[model samples]
Target chain A: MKNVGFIGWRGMVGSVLMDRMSQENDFENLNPVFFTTSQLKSAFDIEELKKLDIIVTCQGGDYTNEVYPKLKATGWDGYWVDAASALRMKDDAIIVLDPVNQHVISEGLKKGIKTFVGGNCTVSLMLMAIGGLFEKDLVEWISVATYQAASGAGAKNMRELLSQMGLLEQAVSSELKDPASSILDIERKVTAKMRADNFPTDNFGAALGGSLIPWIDKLLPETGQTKEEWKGYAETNKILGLSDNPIPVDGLCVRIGALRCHSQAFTIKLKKDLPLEEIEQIIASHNEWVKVIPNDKEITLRELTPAKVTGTLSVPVGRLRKLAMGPEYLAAFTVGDQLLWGAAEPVRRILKQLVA
Target chain B: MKNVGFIGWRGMVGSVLMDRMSQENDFENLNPVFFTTSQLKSAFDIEELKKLDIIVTCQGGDYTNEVYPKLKATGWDGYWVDAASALRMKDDAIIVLDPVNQHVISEGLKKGIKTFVGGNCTVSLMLMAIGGLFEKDLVEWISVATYQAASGAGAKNMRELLSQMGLLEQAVSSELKDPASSILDIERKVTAKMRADNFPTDNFGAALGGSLIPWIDKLLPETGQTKEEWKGYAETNKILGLSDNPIPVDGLCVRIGALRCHSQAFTIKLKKDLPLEEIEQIIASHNEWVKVIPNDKEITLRELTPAKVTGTLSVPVGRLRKLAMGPEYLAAFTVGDQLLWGAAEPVRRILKQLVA
Candidate 1:
């Protein structure tokens, strides 16, 4: 059994990763070691980490920035698998989304690549949902609008969303008892509560309960896109091994009330206008987890949504149709569990790939 | 003074229109008569309605379908100002968005057009936000992804969203008390509650508290677009008097948890790659109520959001930038109270326009 060390297993993404691994009995085949940054008021134990054959972390970029270089400088030559973007863009690291980019991982392994990193959550999920279009080279460019979740911010942000929602309900609790209550009056009170000085905004920077934040991650001044939006273009091409001639994937990323699911609406410009049936087949055939929901009202309302897919591995894509702009313009909406497909599942699968 | 008969004043959009008119002291200049469909078991008193100089309805299409033609058959030659889409597409009726297309309304009035109707909520809000680009003939097409509110569904939907949110909080309240409790566990409970057989899905047909519905309005079988998405193209062109050569407006319309505001993210393809400064000036200078928020992080986080704009008349557009795809592709986001600019505000303004 290979010795595997785990760090950041307590965070939101880490917790999800740990849960998924435990569900799949991933730890049975490996000798697992758990490390904490808070042990004895000091950094993690370097000696213990050096003893492992592989180290996996979901501890975010700050921890990676501090510890990764020193471990490498100490001449520890074991594999490093990470879920942070810190090492993702580095030349020596490969962004792993094994189902979509397993060949890239295999080729990198053959070329003496030792570091494997997960792609951005949104990028990996986008690829997982519609990789067949890219595989067929039929996509011209993709314009996406994201409905991200509070969990993407962190565990605290998720709690804050609940608390914020609670405050809104509390403000209108009495009035809500009577269906005859004035809706505008109830709404005004709810709005006032959201704007109250005491409303929870510490982690989220604003209320995301009855509202949405249109921007995510840090601002990139060079290009007016947020760092999160930039990842849509950068990491997607990197995962596809097409950094030389990249496909353009750009759009707005907005944070909403969903806990762990990320939903996206896409306006895809195809290189060639294909029939609806052919396009549906391309998406459904891409992966086992991807489900092509029919564009019927009953099926779409019941299936292709965050409420249906949360905490599950399924990625359901629906609302597929040609746009009024032209036959080449196709529209689609997809939902996936951000923690499952977006963050944790890929890392778990990649770890198993390495072990195999 | 013109005598105006107000129908559907008790419903959602009608309520908003009444509120705005009261706030603006609009009724002081005109004699107002309120009518309700439920006043008697029989139909509304058309004799009283025929006595009015103008009939304004925020009533839905069915009421208009029953009353409009019958009232016209009586040769009661008063102006018809409507907040419904029933008569919006008819040749004799003008879709009124005064600030953006007053010329169209004025010319229609000169051409013996008597019925003035409001555009679709999303279409009106979209025009109010970015009408300047269309005015300059700078837009090639617009791809919109909407974060519409529960209020767009009706009064019961807003209440149901609150109840659904309350149930979710109730399911996870104890777990959230201890921040150390498993976030996945809390999320699982919330998800289960949302999917529970007794969950509130009556008005929305799905849980929209922590999740979203991608399709709005009824399905259009022939076009494979929802009636709501179809309105984005049809109503926009009619309002702009560009039915002969409409600029393609296409994309997804999603319903989120916001109370009364509708937010949209746009990927606008500009006919010319104008400078960012010039583009900002064009949008900002177009209208009185339209505020062009900067691409800065703090301002966008603070000002340009559904939470900030709900219940207000201001339409704030932000996240303006050049995408990595090309400079011609401008990404923008805008928010407005759907009941205000989207539904009621326009009809009130158009009524006042006819009075002027």
Candidate 2:
């Protein structure tokens, strides 16, 4: 049994991972050490990290960047499981999406690859929804429009959206009682208050109250794409192991007014014109977590919305259709709990894989 | 002066047009007749409708279909102005977007075409933003995803959205304070009550409070595109007079959790590889109603949201960029008053254009 150390196990994603680990009784045979960042006193350093056989980090990119260099200098080539993107694209690191890239992960494990990173939530969700067709090498190109939630920006972002909502509601009620107060005036006050909270706006670039923000992460200088947008371009091809002949996957990523889960509108152009039933069957047979809702009117909000599926494991897909534009164009709408599939659950699954 | 009779003037769109008409003293020069559907009674028929020089109908497709056919049977062919899709697609009827299809509209008038129809709101909003490029024969292909508002569906849809928001807020609060009450249990009850109202969900197929509905109007039988989606495909072509050799414009249309002013995420694949500045210039210079916000981070949410532009004349366009995918793909976001430019405003403007 390996001795494992957990860092940032108290964060939004980290806490989710810790809960899921407990639920599955994953710690039954392993020796686990849990410590918060504040608990790591000045007396302790990377040399102390050598005691564990494996280190799992959910502390995020900057923390990983700062600590990984010093830890690597100590020549501790132990197993590294990270939920951060800091070391994701590094040649030595393999991104794990257990079902989609389980073979890639296994191959890396055999080749003595010790570092594994969790894929982005949108990438993971998209792959989970249609990874079977990808594995079958049937996909030609994909154009997607992401309606991401506040939680993708982390807990602070979730709170930022909530705070804005609360402020707007308050402004709304006050205006209702005071007839002279205009809706525009109340809205203006609420927006100024949102801007005044410089800290919250730092996590989310704008006030996302009843509005959508298009830009996410820092824009790559040469490419003119945000870091978040670039992740789908790189991580998806890398995980699918199609880097030699990469499938073109590109589109807009916008932050919408949702608390959790990320929804995407997709126009996937396949190499062949296949039956709609065949496509649904391919998606359904691939993974246990995916819930394929029939494209019928009776299917309501409770079955598919982020509010309903926030804590659940299922990634619900519906509104699938053959585009009139062409035989190859298939349109689909998918929603998944970004925290589970997008962040924490993948790390837990990778830990299970590592032990095996 | 031409004598005009108006039907369905009491409707949401009709009422908006009536207000604007009265504000502009539209009935000042023209001889006008107005009668509600109820006031017309069983004795009244299409014989009374053709008595006027031009009859404007805001009564929906069903109403337009029933009346226009009977009116056409008379072979009066004086003039017919309609805001419904029923006769709008008829061979004799012309879909009008005065700024975009003014020449087409004028040509139809000269050729003795009396039926003039209002184009779809989203198509009107899109062309209003970048009509210059399409008019100049600069655009080749276009792909778009719409984040439409509740009111686009009508006044009832807006009320439905607001009511759903209230119920969800109640559910959220009631569930939050009570730990004993499970979220699932609360969500189920809330959903049932939402449907039980049978009021809001009638306009939308599902609860749209903090949720999105991917399906719009009725889905086309074989192609899987909704009637609403097909409007963008066929109507844009018909209005632009590109039905013969159309530039492909296809994507998803989602009804989001907003009250008014439809927004869209657009990736316009233009024929020319143009500079980002030039593209912005093309859009800004093309329309007087379009206000181009500088693509800067500090641009406030108060500037570009549906709430900000809901009742205003300006269709705010922002977040313009040269997409990294290719030199031809120009990315832009737009928000426009769905009622003004979308439905009623076009009808009002066309009336003015006819008088001029």
Candidate 3:
């Protein structure tokens, strides 16, 4: 059994994986050690991390970038798994999302690659839903608009949004005498107060309670695309194993008020016109991990909403059909937890695959 | 001056127009009469409307459909202005957004056409932002994703969303222990209860407090596209007076949880690459209505939010840039008051043009 060391065990993604690991009992065969970011110094003592066969870190990109080099300099020769964007597109690193493109990781393993990186939350979620089609070479181009949740920015962002929402609601309720006439007035005042410096604003500088931040992440100075948006283009091609001429994947990522699930509206142009039923079948080919929601009224709320799918690992996709523009154009709406399949479960599943 | 009789004066759009009319005093020169749906019985004396120079109806579509024919059948001959979608695409009718294409309406008046229809809120708002570029034939294709507000649906939807948001906040704060961990738990409970029969769900059947509904308007049975989405494609062509080869406008409209301003994220593919400075210049030439907000951090929450522009007449466009895809593709984000330029103020402005 492989000895596994977990860093950032209390973070947003690490904690989620730890919770799932305890529940699934999947890590029982492997020896496990946990450490917070502050405890890493003691953890790497002569008594510590060198003893592990595999190391897992769900800390963010900065932490991963800082710690990984130190471990490599120590001549550490164990396996590594990271849930951060720092090392994702590195030539030698393996991007892991087991169910969607496990073959890519297998190719890395066969090359004796040791370090593995998780895909972006949105990319992993997107591939989980439509990877079957991509693998089959069915799609040509994709343009997507993301309705990202507060959690995608991390636990701090999630808490800031919730606290802002609470304040806005309280203030609006206090001033709301007649909603018809005063809705705009009260909502404006409360949102203004929430956006004030007194309130906590995360990476989403705006309140993001009843509003949106059109800009996500730092903008790439030369390209004018934010880092978050650029990832969908580059990371998507890498995971799909498109070698030279990759599919055009342009994304417009926006941060909305939802808490957990990151929902995206996608318009995909196919190489050829396929029947809607056949498309659904291709999406459902990974039915063990993906849930193909049929076109039903109640399915929107009862089965497919962020509220319903907040804690689940499965991605629920619906509103799928041939667009009126032409047979070659397809449209779909998808929702998946930024915490589950997006970040943590992928890492857990990758670990499972490594051991098996 | 023309004699105009306004119907459905007590409804949301009508009420907004009434407020604007008083502010502008644009109705004093015209002989105007107001009536609710019930009171319209007497305005048509002898159970028939007498011939007048002009008649304007700010009632909704259903009311216009019910009443317009009755007035016309009474042998009344006069100019007609309808703030409904009832007669928008008819050969004899004109869809009016005066700033964008007032020349189209002027040509109708020269030919002595009577009926004028208001454009859909989303289409009108989109044109209000980028009408200058389109008028000069700068755009080749458009892809838009709408982050619509509750008010675009009506006063009922706005009040319902706000009320539900209040209830959700109260319930969430009641159960909130730690803002980070308990957010999803409390939010789910309240939203689920809000989705139940307990709270009011407007045309948006789900509780739109902290969530989104991907479905908007009735889905066309043949093509699964919503009526709202199709309007962007059809109405943009008519309003722009494109003759043979109109630019393709693909739309995906979704309702978010905001209160008033209807916001749209647009990626426009131009016919040829234009300088970003020239693009900004074309947008700013229509400076009377469209406010070009420069790329700045504070503008998002302070000046360009729904809270900031909810009741204002101006459409604010920001985050304008040439995207990473190519120089031909440009991105813009805009917010407009659905009541002002979207529905009511346009009707009032057309009335102003009628009198001037």
Candidate 4:
């Protein structure tokens, strides 16, 4: 068995991966170890570090310049599978989307290149579908509106949302009896009323409770694009080899009260007009992991709902329609678990590939 | 005070409207009464009906053939605000959009024709914006996707969704501990795990809990459009008087886990290219209760969320963006309570017009 070590393993994404790995027998194939930032010196027994075959980095924020280099400096010849943005934009790095971007894994292994993957889960899955389609033609532009969960920002945000929801509900219920409740009571009641599952969000931000925040990452100056949007553009271009074309993408990232899923409404105008039927057929036939749901079918695109599809690896697409202006305009909606495909699953797949 | 009797007052839309009215001093001007469906003999108490100057009907389903003649037979000829579909499509019937179609209310009163209005709320609010834009020849085609609440289907549907949500949360929670728990246990756990404050769907369908049902109404055979789409076309045409031009409209009615608000994402293709600044100005300048939120602003469209805007008379629009296709394509999103502006507000506006 090859020993595998994970840095920042106590965090939400890290914890989820650890929980899943603990229950899964296949994960037992690799001996696992966890480390905190301060324990680096004492945690790494130098002899053990050299024996390790892989180091899975799961720390939050920009771990690339700080944590990653320290791992390499420890004389660990093992391949690095980073689930953080630390090495993502490096020229030698590969941003992987498993099953969808499995070819990148093969290429990485052949070249023995250390890999860094992107952050946003929805983007990873979206690019997989887009990359597959782009092989047929060049993609010039994409417009996406994201409905993100509190968990996207990690546990703190999730906790905040849950707390806010609790407070709002209590307020609403209490006010039913006394409509003349104080302005404070009304505000408290209104604040607690969110649609998200009462998942804990203590680790994310201020109470996300029942409210929807429109901006995801901080907005970039002049461009009005968010850091999330910039990451999406950079990561997508790098993965799809569209760096030259550099498709212009704009995003509206809204924080919804959903527990785990990240849903996106996307419109892509292809450089050429592809028949709607053919596009539908291509989407349906291309990937088993991706489900293409008709907009008007018994279960609509909206029906491939995040709550329903949670815990599954599948990304569901529905409401594929031709834009009225012309056939070249194609619109579709997709939903996936940001925690799963967006963070955990891709990391899991990359590790498996590294060991294999 | 004039006595007002509600035939299907206990029904979802009727009950919600009643709830709102009960809290307002203005409603004191009209005394209210409720009757069960089986109480036909009691319902025919013309002595009770004759005390009313206006009869606001929110009876469920199509009443054109069965219920309207019954009301006429009672010899209660007070100015009628028919909220049901009985007279909506007739040549002289006015289907009103409250603030947007207030002019129609005057026309109806002038002709001494009882006012009939569309019951579908999503279509009603959509027309308020689309109708105004159409007059300027700005909109050529529209595609709408509605995130409808269970309340749109009436009180029963609302209960069903809440019950389903309870089951789903319970199921998820129990399965977390005992992986072998039955599906029932898992569902219950999921529901229990849900925050107590989130809207309950105790009276609706079992499958609707914590999930989305995409199609709300049956598809029309003639146009293959869902009832939602048909209502979009009918309501928009009626409100805008665009019967001659007949702008093409498509809709996807999806039932989310929410209880009240209806959210819509719309893409409009304009007849001419307008600068983003100019389009924003037009939306701001439009004299309707609708609020057009600027996407570039710090607050997002979702922040002006449907749930937040639920009880208000205003339709909130946000996430306005210029589509990548060209200047001709503009996209925006809006949300309103399905029961409020979409249903009750329009009726209240029409009634106010008649009384004035």
Candidate 5:
């Protein structure tokens, strides 16, 4: 059995990875050794880390930036799996979404690739939802608008969102209790509280309970896209091994109040007009978990939503139809748990693949 | 003074119109008479309605459908200003958006156009944000993704959103209080409750407090676009008087958790590439209320959000930048009170315009 070292095993994404590994009984197949960044005896101890055959990190970019190079320079030939963007774009690393890009992963392994990183939450989930179209080479360009969850930001942001939601309800508790109470009055009081300096925005930098933030991550000066938005292009193409002539994936990324699941509305410009029935079948059959919810109102209301898909591995895509722009223009909306397909699940699967 | 008969004066949009009119003291210039749909002697009393020199209906499409033709048949000749979409598409009617389409409105008035109605909320808000670009004929096409408010659904939807929010908080209130509680546990409990049959979805038909709805209004079977989505193209062109060769405006419409303000993320394909500074100035200079929030993180965090713009008439356009797609591809976000500029404000202004 190979010894696997775990860093950042206590964060939001890391905790999820731990839970998934435990549930899947993955530890039975490998020797697990947990480490920390802050301990006096840290994971940065190169002599100890060299004993392990693999390292799986859910630590954010900062920890990766500080320790990865030095550890790698020590000539440790072990596999490195990450859930951060720090080394994702490097030439030697491959973005992993095994179900959708297993061929790429297999190719990388044969080529002696050692570093594998998870794709962005939105990009990974999006590819999962529509990888069939790309597999068929039918997509020309994609324009998306994201409704990302708080968990995608961090654990503290999720707590802050809950705190904000509680306070917003408290501000309007009396009015909400009395159904006859003026909604406008309730709205007025809540809006004031959300804008008040005392509102709990320590982690989010702004109120996200009753409102939304249009930009996420750092802004790229040259492209006018948030780093999160830019990932829709850069990471998506890289994972598909299309760096030579990439399909355009551009759009806005906005943060909303969802706790863990991320939702997206997509406008797909198809290379050719295909029948709606054929398109739906293609998407549904692409992956085991991507369920195509019919456009019927009742089914869509029940299935295609964050409330329905949260905590599950299901990726429900619905509201699929051709737009008025032309026969080739299509609209689709999808929901998935950011913690699962978007983050920890990929890293966990990659670990299993390596051990097997 | 023209006697303006107000129908549907007690509902959400009507209440906003009443508030704005009263604040502007619009009644001083015209005689006011409120009417209802349920009364035995209704606003449909053609004799009583015809006696007035003008009529303003916010009672919605059904009321307009039943009474409008009869009133016109009586040759009332009174100006008709509406807050509904029933009469909006008729050749004899003009969509009112004073700041953006005042020229079209004024021209329609001179041509004896008797009926004026407000455009769709998203269309009105989008035009207000970028009307200057339209005025300069710089837009080739616009693709948008909407984060609409509950109030855009209806007054009941607003109440339901609040109710859902309260119940969600209540479900996880104990976990939320203990900051050390597992966020996943809280998420699991809340997701179960949201999916439970007992959750209050009577009005929204789904949970929107912690999640969102990707489609709004009825689906058009032939076009595969929701009626609301179709309005982005049809109503925008009608308001701009460009139905002959309308600029293609298309994309997805979604409902978020906000109470009354609607936020939109736009990807505009400009006719020509312009400097970022010039684009900002053009959008800002178009209207008094359309303030251009800079792309800086601090300013955007404080200013461009539904929480910041909910009760005000302010239309803030921000996150302005050119996309990696090309220099002509611009990304912008805007937020505005749906009740104000979207529904009531336009109707009130048109009433004042006629009286003046």
Candidate 6:
């Protein structure tokens, strides 16, 4: 049995990982240690450090610059599986998409180092679908329009969207109640109305209850792109390994009115004509994790919506169709949780593979 | 003053035109005449024919072959405003998009004879947006994904979709009422559930209340396109005078839950690298009938959703963005009533131009 230490395990991703581990029997083989920032230094004794097989860092953001250097200097080394980007972009580190990039898992084992994976929820599921069809070399370009949930930004963003929605709803409802009220009075009344509903808007940037914000993540100047957009492009390329003939990808990241699932409208332009039937067969035979839905199937784009599927490891795809203009084009959709598949699951899977 | 005769006026388009005409003082100058198919010849006496200056054929489908020649042979030669396509595809015919193609209306008046126009609804609204951006030498390709309302097929299809929803809702509600029922009994009860609220599915080929059926109208064998698809292509070219460039157009006619508006997602590939700001300016300045919605604006796609804007003359456009792969690629979405912009209104405008 190996002792596994989890840093920052009280956060959202931390909580979900703990819950999943509790439900799964296989997780019992490993001993667990939970740590917050205050306990990091004193919590680890030398004997306990020597028994540690893997240190899983779910601490959000760069732990390397923040904590890793001091830990390394202190001689607490077994193997490191930093879930954050602390070592993800390193040349020797591997970014695994679980079953799709399992070969990378074997490579990680041979190197005897912890593997680092990118945080892109749909990309992993998308790559799984793409990898299954890769043998035929059919996909030429992929256009994905994403309906991302606020939870992708962590718990604070989700609460923000909800608070905004509550405020907006009250503002409108208050105006309706007293049409003769002054603007100031109306604003005050609206605030009072929101309080009655037990809603607060102090945390949110905008009302997200009944609205969809087309842009997600603060647009930053890092490499002249938003962090979210760059993550999507870089992670997709790394997982698919089509660096030379890399798939041309475009994305629209919007904050939708949902708690978890991230939905995407994906259009894939094929190199050659593949019948719809054959495509369906390919998706079905590809893997157990990916489910291909029929085009005529009676389901809302939201039912397989991210909210329902975020916690689960399965990827749900639907709305498959042949493009009207191009003979070799297939358009479909997918939904999953960005936090789960995009962040924590990859790290956990990599650790499991290391032990096996 | 001219006496105008309406054929199939009691049907959907005829009824709407009559309703509009009844509210106007100008309509009094035009003496109204109505005829069911059986009364076409004898109903209009020779004296009445001499007084008839215009014949407004609101009659649906292939009016040229059925209604035009007979009227022409009768020496009823005041002036013709054939809203039906009977003479639209003729060598000298004009297919007008009203405000966008107002030049054609002016030309029709100069000809001092009869003129024909296109009744393809999706094509007309689509061309209105396309024509506003038209340049003399610019070559353009339009790929449109249509969400056609049940109203496109008239009253029949609308009734079907509503009926299906009623049935399904009832079945679902019934299951909630009795949890102890056997599985087969529950299925049987749900299948047989039909109440006064439930509509019969006789007119449309299938139930459409809650579902979208992709293809509408008959399929044309030559191009393996549906009638709706071919009409979209033909009318767009005819209205835009892109007949020589072989305007590449692909259309997907989908039936949605909307009762009125036909929504379309359009991607236009232009010859020049038109900047996003410039494109927004052009769209805003183009015409009165089309409204340009900012891509990042806080509005629901459903606000301009078909059901909301069905009866109005306005075409609502939103979700405008520049495609990443191509420099000149621009995508936008629009929603308008096919029956209004596509069919009845254009005919009314042509008649108004000739008489008012």
- In order, the first chain's TM-score in every candidate is 0.97, 0.91, 0.93, 0.84, 0.98, 0.82
**CAPRI quality band, candidate 1:** medium
lDDT of 2 at B307: 50
Q: After superposition, how far is residue A295 of candidate 1 from its true place, in Å?
A: 0.5
- In the range B1-356, model 4's lDDT, one tens digit per residue, is 55555666655566556666665544645555654557222444556655567667777446434655665677767755666765777775677775566666566667787646654677776765444566577888876666666667765564444444333333343344453434323323443444244544344322454445555567565544566657777767676666676776654555665556777767677899877777766765666567777665445533467545756667777666665446676767777777777777667666655544
Clashes of each: 0, 1, 0, 56, 0, 6
Task: Please provide, for model 2 over A323-348, each residue's C-alpha lDDT reduced to its tens digit, 9 standing for 90 to 100.
Answer: 65577778788888887899888899
lDDT of candidate 6 over B96-184, digit per residue (tens): 77677667557765876366575577888776665556643333666566656666776545444444543444454444345343332
Q: Write the per-residue lDDT of candidate 6 for residues A114-230, one digit (tens) a residue.
A: 446454665665765555665467776665555566667656555444344334434555443453433323323433443344553333333333334444554443222245555
lDDT of all predictions: 0.89, 0.75, 0.76, 0.61, 0.89, 0.59
Docking class of 6: incorrect
Alpha carbon lDDT at B90, candidate 3: 84
Writing each residue's lDDT as its tens digit, candidate 3 over B1-356 gives 77677776676677788888999898788877665545244443424345556667776777667667887787777767878888888888888998988888899889978788889999999999988789778887777788899877866676667666666656656455554454445545755665567776645677676678777777676766788887887788888777356677776788888877788888787878998888988997864889887765566546666756767887888777776467887888888988788888778877877867
Q: Put down candidate 5 lDDT per residue, B163-229, tens digits, no spaces.
A: 7877787888889888698878888787888888999999988899999888798988877678888
Question: By descending DockQ, how would the candidates be arranged?
Answer: 1, 5, 3, 2, 4, 6
Q: Could you tell me the lDDT of residue B99 within candidate 6?
A: 71
Candidate with better DockQ, 4 vs 5? 5
When 4 and 5 are scored with TM-score, the better candidate is 5
i-RMS of candidate 1 = 0.9
Q: What clash pairs does model 6 have?
A: A261-A306, A261-A307, B64-B86, B121-B342, B161-B208, B161-B209
Kindly report which residue pairs in candidate 2 clash with one another: A121-A342
Clashing pairs in 5: none
lDDT, model 3, position A167? 68
TM-score of each: 0.98, 0.88, 0.92, 0.77, 0.97, 0.63
